[model samples]
Target: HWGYGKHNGPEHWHKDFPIAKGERQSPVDIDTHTAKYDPSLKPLSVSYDQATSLRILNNGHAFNVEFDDSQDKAVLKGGPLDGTYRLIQFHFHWGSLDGQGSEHTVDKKKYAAELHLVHWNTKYGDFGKAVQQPDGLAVLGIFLKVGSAKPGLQKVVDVLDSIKTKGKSADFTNFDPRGLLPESLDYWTYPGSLTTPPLLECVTWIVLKEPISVSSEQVLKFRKLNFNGEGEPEELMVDNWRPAQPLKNRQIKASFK
Candidate 1:
């Protein structure tokens, strides 16, 4: 369980969960103002096997999905990246410490939530080694916002009860995440560093401009995740999003013609 509100923000999470002090954290603010466009960049593609191999995870912050191509599946039909990269793990960031949850900064703005789509570089064979290459990782960041009470997120909300306690997982065997995408393939891409510690500067960030909408009650559910395992439910690490990282000298390119 967690202790939100008052003073139980990220600053004190390390007190109980030491792993909270990891290098690759989430929940950074996203700003798209100063973003520049690249003239000679090409769009990357994925296969159907890669898409279906996605494994969803609820790390107490927000629901995340991991791609497991080791099983030999295809989600996308294209072949440019056929066996070059392997989709690994992904996570989400939300507003708790602040009202925003993106790890990348554009001009100087942040959003409500940011979903990370992480992939491993097949050329390196290992994730740790892939972290050192410029093209080692590719992440797709989707922004989420709390809207009027709606049922759009029933797919995700339905499972919260199972993992409601903490470190619990439900069988999502038939879950298809394509529905989670905002319907827009147009995105802003660029080279950047990991928002958290170790701050590996090897991520090729692909931040989707479109945002998915969920109900207010759905947001409340996340706010109520408690991991304390006591009779009283503590707010688990619901708002686990980190702040926006420095863009440094990088520019984002878009696939939207």
Candidate 2:
């Protein structure tokens, strides 16, 4: 498996995964001054039912909050998307250092971390099927800045202790995904791919302009999570983020001026 190790990091990914160096890759640098402001862009419609949340898992790379995508209980609409997209899962990426882990950057400024809310197009039926098509997935990226403690995120952080090892999973419910988002809906949109392996060019990136706050202690807790499983030499899961990819002639559209 391709991990964020020195030997198999993003630079060497193209060797095994040819599409890693392909055009339309993700985690691109967002240059606000150059991004086009599209007045016609609609406000993002995000409705996630707390009951749709099922469980949380530590997948050796990052923690994932899985949702019940069997129905349209939680869906994202409007914005740059053509139709409704069902919420499948959400994950995060961070670094060992302060303010330097986010996959996407704003004007070359990296954040403390990044949160990705993964959704698949309903038109494609299922996530597995949608991920192969051109317009299959839509990911909402919210940058995390170090600051005051976020009460909304406390619920998730409180459980990190139980799932500190890879492959560890716990039942998670009654948690509203919207609580993790910022108040503003303004975002920048572009065509991109998944930051991880296979790197499919099927995602419509919707990155928020504003960042959400998290305490430094909370950030440290994320770094405490291990990449190894039980009875293995522990390796800290830090800097689990991909570098920014080239824009490659893609136009980034903004919802606000």
Candidate 3:
């Protein structure tokens, strides 16, 4: 029942989920000045299957593309990870317009949007059990910058028209998410929590230093999605992002200088 409204926004989440105030909570401002460049950190490598892509839906919070995680077809390994993590789903967080949608920031600077590819530790066996472990989840966070329309992102938004309303879904297949990333795999790794509630401190965030591209018009279409269900008061699903939290007792390791 939590939302990005005055009644149940991030500020009020602590009333129910006390861990919202816990250390290592996510979407922290990755200050280049403070983020230590750890040469020991390895480069990240992820392989995703086109067929594993299942469907796209507007889950009231943000639109997400679910994947078949029964097997380790789409896997993420290396770079602060000791084992492989299975891709479960990927979603976006954006504002109604541009300049302020990304959950994580680069020195307090917000991007047009942020893409999170959620993966669960295979060692944990299941996402439910994995969410409770310190190394349970690994989220590849990519900042979306506004630019000329890119084929990678255009394909994603083209399917949004069919899933404008919450709970509505459409078959989304053969989409390679790797195309949505930049050429460089250099990233900042940190111990953090999910940007949304229950805000568990179980995520290893690998935020890419280089951002992908989106278009000005595409962002407007993103605002077209409704948060409310059919016959309910229509609420535009914009600003679906949590602001940067504190960086208490944490060290951000950079794979790049």
Q: What is the C-alpha lDDT of each candidate?
A: 0.57, 0.92, 0.91
lDDT of 1 by residue, 1-257 (tens): 33444475545655665635443333333445544555454554654333553345555445555555564343221222233566565566666543565555445566666677677667777788888886677666777777744343576667667666555566655445555667666577666656444456666666777777766676666666554444555656555655543344444455544
- Local error of candidate 3 at residue 67 (angstroms): 0.5
lDDT of 3 by residue, 1-257 (tens): 89999999999999999999998899999999989999999879788754288899999998999899998889999999989999989999999779899999999999999999999999998999999899999999999989877677788789989988889999998878777878889999999999999999999999999998877888778989999988899899999999898898999989987
Model 2 per-residue lDDT tens digits across residues 194-217: 999989999999999989999999
**Total clashes for model 2:** 0
Ranked by lDDT, top first: 2, 3, 1
TM-score for each model? 0.73, 0.98, 0.98
Instruction: State which candidate, 1 or 2, has the greater TM-score.
Output: 2
Clashes of each: 31, 0, 0
Residue 39, model 1: Cα distance from true site in angstroms: 3.2
Better of 2 and 3 by lDDT: 2
**TM-score of candidate 1 on Cα atoms, chains taken together:** 0.73
TM-score, ranked from best to worst = 2, 3, 1
